[PDB]
Amino acid sequence: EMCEIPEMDSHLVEKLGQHLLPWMDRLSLEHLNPSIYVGLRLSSLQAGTKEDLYLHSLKLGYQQCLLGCQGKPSMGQLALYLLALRANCEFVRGHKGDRLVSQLKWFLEDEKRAIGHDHKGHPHTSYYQYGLGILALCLHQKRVHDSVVDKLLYAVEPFHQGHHSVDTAAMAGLAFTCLKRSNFNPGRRQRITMAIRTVQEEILKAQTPEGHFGNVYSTPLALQFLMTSPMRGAELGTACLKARVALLASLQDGAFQNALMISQLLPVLNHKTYIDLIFPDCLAPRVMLEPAAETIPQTQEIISVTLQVLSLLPPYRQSISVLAGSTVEDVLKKAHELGGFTYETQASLSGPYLTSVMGKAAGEREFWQLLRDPNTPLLQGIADYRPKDGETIELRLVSW
Amino acid sequence: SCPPTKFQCRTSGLCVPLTWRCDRDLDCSDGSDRLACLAGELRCTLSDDCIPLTWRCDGHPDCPDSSDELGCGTNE
Ligand code: CNC
Ligand SMILES: [Ca+2]
Ligand SMILES: [Ca+2]
């Protein structure tokens, strides 16, 4: 059947938008987020004249730093900037536009070379950004060579190496879908068609008993992909409705507070996906967002959190006291304030990313993994996860 | 209502740099605005730029002078 998510409560949706609203005023290149802009335009919600200023900031930052800063955007972020142009019914154009396109095309070419004629090699980034970059170029009707598409095809086709997340598979499917709708790689038409089906079954098989596809935060992008095509022979309808039940429970439980996650979910709640950026409808009516007038309550409770790092000699294990409601990053900050602990973060569209712990920076295909007790990886980053009293947070350097 | 080392625009008033002015494209509003190539690569005609062979005749001008998208199209 077909993947359909029946509309939800307008108040739940507006609540999501209000989380997104403060970011509309944060125009610092460190804070600028093309994904927020895309997600807001594809939604039923609107920020009014704030949007135009946000877009202008994106145009300033991205075109001056990539063609000229502090930390110019990555190529993956450039791809999302391209999606933002489409969200405003623009095609990338002119000499700056044309050169930005070629930069992204260089990104894919380098990543293709890294993967190799062999297909063992990893991308310097991820297959997620690989798929995202193909999608971005396709949405602006820019063609990539068959050999570039082949890498994404081989990554999901039968007897592929590695294992990919639902998120990564969904982004691949979105790329494939854009190629198919645009008739862009006729020499790979039949393989592209088969890849889309493959991604669909991989995603449905990844559906948990609670209803989510992988986890709660993979469900939005997965639903985006599933919504773009019908699935005959399969029971897509029931799968998507069970995903809705899971999604709804997570919303009412406050699972979606991170801005980029909201920006990936809002299109779904408006029956739209990134594929709607092929033929965008920029003038479709959207409800204006006003600031939530909500009085934030101040806690009076102290909680203690055990912070531990066993990846380093000598190991670190300390009980850190913070106000109830604090984030992991607050715990980290307080550990640093007590002495004996240090760390580093870098900016990303999902917020602060943990790069270094106590002098040790994650190397190639390594990262600092966040875990809680017992041996359970967090589903949120240091700025979003809020530990309970008595919980133990581990920072573990892992290879993937 | 704008700065000295930036431009101003007349319909949005959103100020714009002026290494953007005015560079044959509409950044504003209104309008008041040798090192041998690697194997498998290809050199541009009016410059030193190198591009993968697969970017020749792919519908987008990757060379500053669009050398790669001239002689399109062939047959075979
Ligand atoms: C690949 C990827 C994936 N990951 Co990771 C996973 N698993 N991630 C990152 C990878 C980065 C390295 C790499 N080679 O790219 C990788 C494999 C190490 C990974 C690790 C993180 N991930 C994890 C999560 C939970 C986040 N990640 C996602 C962005 C999940 C993503 C899926 C998704 N839906 O986005 C994902 C598929 C694609 C992200 C991307 O490239 N976006 C496009 C890119 C152009 O935007 P960007 O902002 O510039 O990308 C950077 C950031 O995304 C940063 N980053 C990656 N993950 C996070 C998570 C947070 C919370 C923050 C603040 C930044 C990041 O790394 C990217 C640069 O390489 C998120 C959806 C994944 C998910 N389904 O759970 C999720 C985030 C959930 C949320 N509520 O925000 C970890 C927290 C796991 C853990 N318990 O340790 C961990 C972050 C630890 C830390 N040091 O802060
Ligand atoms: Ca100009
Ligand atoms: Ca070309």
Numbering used by the authors:
A (entry chain A): 1 to 68, 78 to 409
B (entry chain C): 53 to 85, 129 to 171
Sentences from the paper on this structure:
Mammals depend on dietary uptake of Cobalamin (Cbl), which is a cofactor of at least two enzymes that are part of essential biochemical pathways. CD320 is a member of the Low-density Lipoprotein Receptor (LDLR) family, a large group of mostly multi-ligand receptors involved in cholesterol uptake and other physiologically essential functions. CD320 features an N-terminal, extracellular fragment comprising two LDLR type A (LDLR-A) domains separated by an epidermal growth factor (EGF) homology domain, the exact function of which has so far not been determined. While the majority of related LDLR domain-containing receptors bind multiple and distinct ligands, CD320 has been reported to bind TC with high specificity and affinity as evidenced by the lack of interference in TC binding from related LDLR ligands like LDL and RAP as well as high affinity for TC of both the full-length receptor and its soluble ectodomain81318.
Deletion of a single glutamate (ΔE88) in LDLR-A1 of CD320 has been associated with Cbl deficiency observed in patients carrying the mutation. To investigate whether a structural effect was underpinning this defect, we generated a complex of TC with CD320ΔE88, characterized it biochemically and determined its structure at 2.6 Å resolution. However, the purified complex displayed increased propensity to form non-specific multimers as analysed by SEC, requiring an additional SEC purification step for crystallization. As the mutant complex structure was of lower resolution than that of the wild type, we confirmed the positions of disulfide bonds and bound Ca2+ ions by using anomalous difference peaks from data collected at a wavelength of 1.77 Å. The TC-CD320ΔE88 structure revealed a similar domain arrangement and binding interface as the wild-type protein and we observed no significant changes in TC or the LDLR-A2 domain, ruling out a gross structural effect of the ΔE88 mutation. As seen for the wild-type protein, the region of LDLR-A1 carrying the deletion (EEE loop) revealed poor electron density and higher B-factors when compared with that of LDLR-A2 (average B-factors for LDLR-A1 and A2 Ca2+ ions ∼112 and 56 Å2, respectively). Moreover, electron density for the Ca2+ binding residue Glu86 as well as Glu87 and disulfide forming Cys88 (equivalent to Cys89 in wild type) was missing. However, the centrally bound Ca2+ as well as the LDLR-A1 acidic necklace was clearly visible in our structure indicating intact Ca2+ binding. Even though the apparent Tm of the complex was slightly lower than that of the wild-type protein, approaching that of the LDRL-A2 domain alone, the mutant protein bound TC with equivalent affinity to wild type with a calculated KD of 1.5 nM. At least in vitro, these findings rule out a compromised ability of CD320ΔE88 to bind TC.
